[model samples]
Target: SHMTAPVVRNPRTQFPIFHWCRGGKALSMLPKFDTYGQSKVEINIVGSGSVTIGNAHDDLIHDAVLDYYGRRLATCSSDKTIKIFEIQRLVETLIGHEGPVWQVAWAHPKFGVILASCSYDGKVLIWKEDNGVWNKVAEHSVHQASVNSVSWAPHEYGPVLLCASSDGKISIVEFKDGGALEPIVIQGHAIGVNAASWAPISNTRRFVSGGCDNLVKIWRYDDAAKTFIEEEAFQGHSDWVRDVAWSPSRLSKSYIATASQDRTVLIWTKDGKSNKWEKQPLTKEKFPDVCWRASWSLSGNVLAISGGDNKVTLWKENIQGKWESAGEVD
Candidate 1:
């Protein structure tokens, strides 16, 4: 039996303490509040499918990338060739990497998959995948060593690729308004950097880099330095960390997919203010071999881990909040 005929004494939040105006009907909760346009942040996981890499490649296929829409595929090979695939029918073969291409990345669709490729030649080749032909834009022969990874930031950040090179440097290779190339380098890693990726949140100028130092470094723009600098570092890997992929989110918890040469794949999670990253093994079970790369789908719900094992494995969270095998690419 409840006493006192229900006057608002407060059950949960009592901090504001409801003021009684002798009228319980005009009850109001004292409290708070928005800038910015709207954006869809719905959680979506499209059904997975397979695609046979529509034929063509002599040597090892270094990296194969698809445009933001998952169409217009570009596969770079160790044979110093680039092939774009519509599906099975051949589109066109382009060349220019003096040395074997190490990686290929396609930018936002707005730019027509204006792709970027890094190579053993220690350069970043910017190419605009136009029509059936590929128009090469610019090149940065800035590094003395092989460029290991090439990844584009989210469309909100414009046309750019955060490229990691074995030269102990990471370069933000941006194509300016006039087709001019801006190669800004930071001494990213000492021993050597293998991978670098943007944080996916466009508002914040942040990126995460993993390298031979066995360190995962969080980087953000430093106004004073006029460049990006390390903001935080985590040591969960013993061997060289091959790649780091920050999941795409509109306004959600940050999840970083990390793959290392130590055969470990981890998902580092972070959320609102004062939150530190918490590393959770994407898979407690071991891999067949070294995990060479980590990539997140556009929706950010699936992680693709590709590696020395000669396969790309997709991990997705299910109803149990546990990562499970969603698909695999052979």
Candidate 2:
């Protein structure tokens, strides 16, 4: 069985309607976005291959996921192009990087649209759009190998960005009025660095990173000295650590979640450094499959993890503080 429909514009493009197909066969007749929109708003299908709107030709688009503002979309391809789509139309195609762009992110609270992209050629370039033209702002080489992930600091006031690479190094770059502050590079992971994320710090600047090194590290900035210091490292996973994310709740409880090739989703916490990791628990379904990414929701109550299986698991901590699998996606 399969389904099909035409891709149409919803005024804001805040949501794109794609016709769903199953078993290479079209099923139901064309349905309107209003149908799916009524089902769920916050959670909807992001992308799919078997879906198409009528006879629209497939551009073989990859990474055509929701943009930073969910209302727009950004996609990159093996064709060496980074295309930004807004309101169901091509806004711009950013070209210049020599290799296929693997990942892209929008910087937070910057005056302009600051984007960071990593390519297979092992270079990370920062781009910014002024008026209507996009230009490369800063370019740097930090990885002997390819960069797998790049993330910008969530702070809207201060300018800071972090990048992680397959070379197993995480560099923190701070932007100033004239130029960038000297970047601080932290090294300790045994394998490649897979992911990095800056947590919400009330007074100080701190972030967490996890990678194939099977370790998760917490870093903080020394306000007086203006340098990043290794605050703590959480070691528990026996395989490559795929991703780490900090809780969004601005509570006294500091926590992070990690996914690993060990087929487990682990949660860690520290009480103002008095405790290193107060809790560590595996997903109830843990076995030996690989999970690649984990993230916290805006509410900080839910943790999402993606693994080798077709499903993405959503976990939540009960009143007892133990993580329980509350949901799953397939």
Candidate 3:
């Protein structure tokens, strides 16, 4: 008769090889390498609780809503009217802008919900929401061409706002508390700039923009110099670049994801160079074509893309730091 010794094994070894050397002993690989599966990505369907406020005139679509002072929802519609909705109830509607409003964003540093809207009629309207009322604070007709998008800089120790237009220009506007307004327009591109997004990282005072001419541009606002300067311009998309979004939780340096009408989503990186954009090809199953909008999740790991189809796609950075689709919804 013969007896055999029972075999024992480390559970981690049974899985893929993980190299983590610590004090001559392999550190547990389950926590470091396998965090992807354990990490929870939540998809919250907000505003799914629908309430019907009266519709705006002139088709009144492509509206942007902001909860001014985080109290009331103010919506700017294509009908050239800014309607203030209180907890799903229409409170007041302000009118006077001559064109179809294209975009609206709240002023970051202002106490009230300072709002700016660009219209197809080539005007940039600035309004202030206070005491449950919206007042026209300032207005500027910067673009001889139609304005497409507007964004407000983060409320830092200073105040700043930006506007992009069909005129193929980006304008930087600055104001102080109870002070005069100073606006500077920078000619950057050849065609209409359709989208502008301010960096969510505080005090950076930087924003990324995409336009009809298939260009993604980066601009930086220096607080000390009080000037907005073009840092770089990226060209790749054959058609319009509809939306560009910077990663919220950036590591080392800023990274951006741009969606375009050329049926591709490009992931770009910012460095000290002229060619900073790195196009990561999307899988055919995930992003097919004309990706109109790209938004970074609050966690900064997943990106939500929409356009050209009914599907909403989610992408994440792989272990090698490449963009990969996590899932999709149609």
Candidate 4:
């Protein structure tokens, strides 16, 4: 009798609690201070287990990414902007257009000082810095709906942006001789495509895409047609797939991880000899809510999955090769 039923707080515009996972998994990673105050994020996976980055409250980050060398960081937030940080200082506040920014990707250093960002405004913009002056270099209005993800292909493949959108399309925008080129657009999914990631450096150009259709698809570029074609579709999620990541490993253990609205994360491995995919849930029943992002550490040494529960969990394989949990990160 002393405790009344849980009361609802003031209703505000929000989803089921979107999250940003910074490698380590620990409940203590939750904010421990006023929303407007600076907080220490303890990430066991990184230096000193604590990274003091940008963030405060509702206007916090949706994506936290590091440059290819893991030296600089670029992040996007609900505040509808991106902040590039070189650690001690916030390098720049990148402003392009309206609508919130979804993700920011860094092209391989070989491409010089360049970054690409996708946004809720249904466009992707390339940003480059020259003599510390950063500005929007090119705008891609190839999608009819909000662009959801932007990924840079392996530098060896040259400067390319692999993008996905809510309009059920994927665009491979290329840069040639220091100039932006038209995007090679293709219908990818039945409806909204949530995310797309390029495969690690390989002889062939390949990528993975996840969508509202509850399937994870593998696409490859056929040199003859010079167009990416869907080679295989992995059907394992019973609900909309939220994010898909292909491992960045240069090893023979080629794999992909897909998170879904069905509260599951499926780890699919491909055989080098057979070129077939094998799916294994990263303990699906353990997720308490709809999973959103399935991210692999750039080294492909760790897999982190974040969901609506506002929780982050890391997964890894035993020395022998089966996916197992690494607990939630902070």
Q: Which has the greatest lDDT? A: 4
Cα lDDT tens digits, model 1, 134-227, are: 7887887778999988878777777777889888999886687635367788898778999988776654589999898899999998877878
Worst 10 residues of 4 by lDDT: 12-21
Best-performing candidate as measured by TM-score: 4
Mind giving the per-residue lDDT tens digits that candidate 3 earns over 195-232?
88887654456788898878888888777777767777
Give the total clashing residue pairs for model 4. Answer: 6
Where's the lowest-lDDT run of ten residues in candidate 1?
A: 12-21
Error of 3 at 47 (Å): 7.3
Where is model 3 poorest over a 10-residue stretch in terms of lDDT? 12-21
lDDT of 4 by residue, 1-330 (tens): 586889677731222222233333211233344577644332121553445543422465556666655556676766888887764567888887588888888787887779888888998888888887788878888788989999888877779889999999999978775556767899999989999998987788899999989989999999999899999988889999989988878677688889898988888897777667788888837587788777677664688877767666778888778777788665
Q: Work out the TM-score per prediction.
A: 0.77, 0.75, 0.74, 0.83
Better of 1 and 4 by TM-score: 4
Alpha carbon lDDT at 168, candidate 3: 84
lDDT of each: 0.70, 0.63, 0.64, 0.76
Q: List the residue pairs that clash in candidate 3.
A: none
Off by over 4 Å in 3: 1-60, 68-70, 176-180, 200-204, 222-226, 270-277, 285-289, 328-330
- The residue-by-residue lDDT of candidate 2 on 1-330, one tens digit each, is 464876687640111221122223211111123554542221232333223222111222223344444433455545667776552456678787676666677666344667777766677777776776667777767678777677777666366768888888888776655355477777846678887888886677788888876888888889887777788878788888877778777677787888787888788876764654665775556744577666666664677665555355667888777777786643
For model 4, the stretches where C-alpha displacement exceeds 4 angstroms are: 1-51, 54-58, 69-71, 177-179, 284-286, 298-301, 319-321
From the highest TM-score down, the ranking of the candidates is: 4, 1, 2, 3
Error in Å for residue 217 of model 4: 0.5
